[PDB]
Design a protein around this nucleic acid. Structure first.
Ligand SMILES: [Mg+2]
Ligand SMILES: [Mg+2]
Ligand SMILES: [Zn+2]
Length: 600
DNA sequence: CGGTACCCGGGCATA
DNA sequence: TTGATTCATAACCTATAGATATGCCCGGGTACCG
RNA sequence: UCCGAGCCGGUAGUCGCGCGGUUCAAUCCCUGGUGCGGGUGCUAGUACCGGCUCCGCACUAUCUAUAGGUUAUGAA
């Protein structure tokens, strides 16, 4: 449920023109960012130093104690046995790490809220990493050990001999996940590679469940897998394969948004005593520093401000909190045909790397939202160029290029990395302290919002005030094919949902191999013509590319006697849009998806 | 000079 | 869908988790008394 | 290491066509849009009325930190 929402507005328009409050909040957020960064680094340092014997169990108390020790040192006096024990255990190396990195103790006062937020965020990052990239990383390690790439490149494809190996590995996956109990003969029959992989997997001491797979165990108790993940990272480093970040480190020196609440407000911004704060209403207390009459603070869908924002000094995130807060396959068009039937107009979109949205309707009014247009309107390319120019002028790129890997588990290498970072820490901090980096983020947000609004307005003008959007199911989410730029595929669903425009998915399978004029796939031609590579550096290198967005039909019926080409040329995006139109018409007419596009 | 008791602000804990 | 190994700093995207307030005490100062 | 969109043709619903011609749109500064009125500012010939610009009435628009893949750059 949408219990929370945010209206991101500018810093100038969010707060009243009082320099004292602005300076106080800027200083506070800077201090909290420094504390979070150094706390993540100290946690990594402690884990690597104590890894000589065993991996310590990391809990909320551990990170909280690390943060408190960094801020105050031994002056922190926890009143609970667990926190006291954590402080006693973690104290010895905190000062050593601070001296190594020259970390001067800030001894910030009234850090309760900020330390709690940072500890919660760090534990969240740990849990998210463990959940997301444990199973995936383990399977990646298994495949790397099996050398699946080598077998694929060397062994014949689509053959029973290698289908046998594929089935063998698929069945062994269940044994690795403990879903299927292996027999003694099954274990004996394992080849040396399979036996070694099974033994190494068991060395991680992975948890187990009686009636559920390993993924269910990860979902239920993800935190228990942290030692296994660390050992897997160590194995990755030992074997020489590319390393991965097991412990999340907040290495970015750019100013980061810091939560600011009413307590922080009256402790640092207003600097009034807790006694006086309780005597004033929250809205009245906030009006002294924020213009609540501003549009950004208006209530939407029953949600109110309730005094909670995160600011980075340039853009202010104003969060609207619903009164009911916690107090601290169905999207496909096949299942949404009635909505399309009652829609005033139906528009089908075929996502692509370049043509992010290629739109068409029954009336034939074509519309597209290309990647180049998005780059121009958002300004990502211009901002990247300016950032590169600034880095070259300041020489920051040279400094950063020599920073060792943060993902290494080696203690001495990590110490050298920390020393290198400290060598030019001041220069990079000063460079990234420039307002452009935050102002760049704020301007990127504004440009993206304006581009989305313009896209919606153009679509409404072309197709009408009310219309329904049908989009292909293809989505390069998470993964991204190498040598290809990132593209927005799944965010358009959210964008259309925000603008109260229906967004229904559709299967793109074999939607670029059918000619609409004859509804046949035999005569469709692909990659028939060659031309120099469109990418300038490849073109200079002399490479040649095959056209993918151009398709033609060899069917004589589609041709005309006067033509000399011998084929009816087509646009890949246009073909996909026409095929989607035909599929949607068939579905709405009740005939279902055409048999030509149907799967095997 | 020496000792007792109350209030305020902040530190620390927990839902 | 569309192109043909290791590291760091940005970005784009995608996914995950979290998105504040009240109470106890303690010690340091002050008022009061002997 | 580069790139806006629309229209007219070579095209016949064709190409990262570094194919030709033509129209307006953005490069700084800016949270965005939607319906109402006013104030008068600019846009058109005598209330006809569309458009751009501000004012304020109310409906709507979730961000943050981290990891992964990729891109740009700097190193290998
Ligand atoms: Mg598609
Ligand atoms: Mg396509
Ligand atoms: Zn055909």
């Amino acid at each position: 449920p949408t219990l929370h929402t945010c209206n991101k507005t500018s810093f100038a328009k969010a707060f009243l023109p009082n320099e004292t409050y602005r300076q106080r909040l800027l200083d506070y957020i800077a201090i909290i960012h420094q504390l979070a960064d150094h706390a993540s680094h100290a946690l990594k340092f402690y884990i690597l130093s104590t890894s000589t014997s065993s991996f310590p169990v990391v809990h909320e108390d551990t990170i909280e104690a690390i943060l408190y020790l960094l801020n105050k040192g031994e002056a922190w006096h926890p009143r609970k046995e667990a926190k006291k024990a954590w402080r006693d255990c973690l104290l010895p190396y905190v000062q050593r790490y601070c001296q190594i990195v020259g970390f001067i103790h800030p001894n910030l006062r009234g850090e309760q809220q900020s330390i709690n937020y940072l500890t919660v965020s760090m534990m969240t990052n740990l849990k998210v990493n463990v959940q997301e990239h444990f199973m995936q990383m383990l399977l990646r390690y298994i495949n790397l050990r099996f050398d699946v790439k080598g077998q694929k490149q060397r062994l014949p494809p689509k053959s029973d001999a290698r289908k046998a190996f594929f089935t063998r590995l698929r069945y062994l996956k269940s044994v690795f996940l403990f879903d299927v109990v292996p027999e003694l003969e099954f274990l004996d029959d394992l080849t040396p590679l399979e036996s070694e992989v099974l033994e190494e997997i068991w060395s991680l001491d992975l948890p187990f469940l009686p009636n559920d797979p390993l993924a269910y165990a990860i979902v239920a108790d993800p935190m228990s897998f942290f030692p296994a993940y660390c050992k897997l990272s160590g194995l990755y480093e030992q074997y020489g394969f590319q390393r991965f970040s097991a412990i999340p480190l907040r290495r970015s020196l750019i100013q980061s948004h810091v939560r600011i609440d009413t307590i922080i407000l009256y402790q640092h911004i207003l600097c009034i005593t807790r006694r006086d704060a309780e005597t004033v209403e929250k809205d009245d207390l906030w009006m002294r520093v924020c213009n609540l009459c501003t549009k950004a603070f208006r209530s939407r869908c029953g949600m109110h401000f309730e005094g909670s924002i995160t600011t980075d000094g340039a853009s202010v995130s104003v969060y609207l909190k619903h009164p009911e807060a916690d107090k601290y396959k169905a999207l496909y068009v096949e299942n949404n045909l009635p909505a399309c039937r009652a829609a005033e107009n139906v528009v089908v979109i075929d996502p692509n790397k370049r043509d992010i949205l290629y739109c068409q309707d029954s009336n034939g009014t074509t519309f597209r939202y290309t990647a180049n247009q998005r780059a121009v309107e958002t300004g990502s390319r211009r901002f990247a160029k300016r950032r590169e120019a600034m880095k070259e002028e300041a020489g920051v790129d040279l400094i950063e290029s020599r920073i060792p890997s943060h993902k290494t588990m080696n203690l001495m290498d990590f110490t050298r990395y920390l020393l290198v970072r400290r060598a030019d820490w001041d220069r990079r901090k000063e460079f990234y302290s420039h307002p452009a980096h935050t102002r760049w983020k704020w301007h990127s947000f504004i440009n993206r919002q304006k581009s989305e609004s313009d896209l919606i307005s153009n679509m409404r003008n072309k197709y009408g005030e009310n219309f329904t959007v049908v989009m292909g199911d293809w989505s390069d989410a998470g993964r991204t094919a190498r040598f290809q730029t990132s593209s927005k595929t799944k965010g358009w669903r959210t964008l259309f949902k925000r603008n109260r425009i229906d967004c229904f998915l559709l299967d793109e399978y074999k939607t670029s191999s059918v000619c609409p004029r004859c509804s046949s796939s035999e005569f469709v031609e692909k990659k028939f013509k060659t031309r120099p590579h469109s990418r300038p550096w490849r073109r200079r290198e002399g490479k040649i590319e095959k056209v993918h967005g151009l398709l033609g039909c060899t069917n004589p019926n589609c041709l005309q006697q006067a033509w000399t080409s011998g084929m009816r040329y087509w646009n890949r995006d246009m073909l996909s849009t026409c095929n989607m139109l035909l599929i949607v018409r068939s579905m709405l007419d009740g005939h279902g998806r055409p048999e030509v596009f149907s799967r095997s």
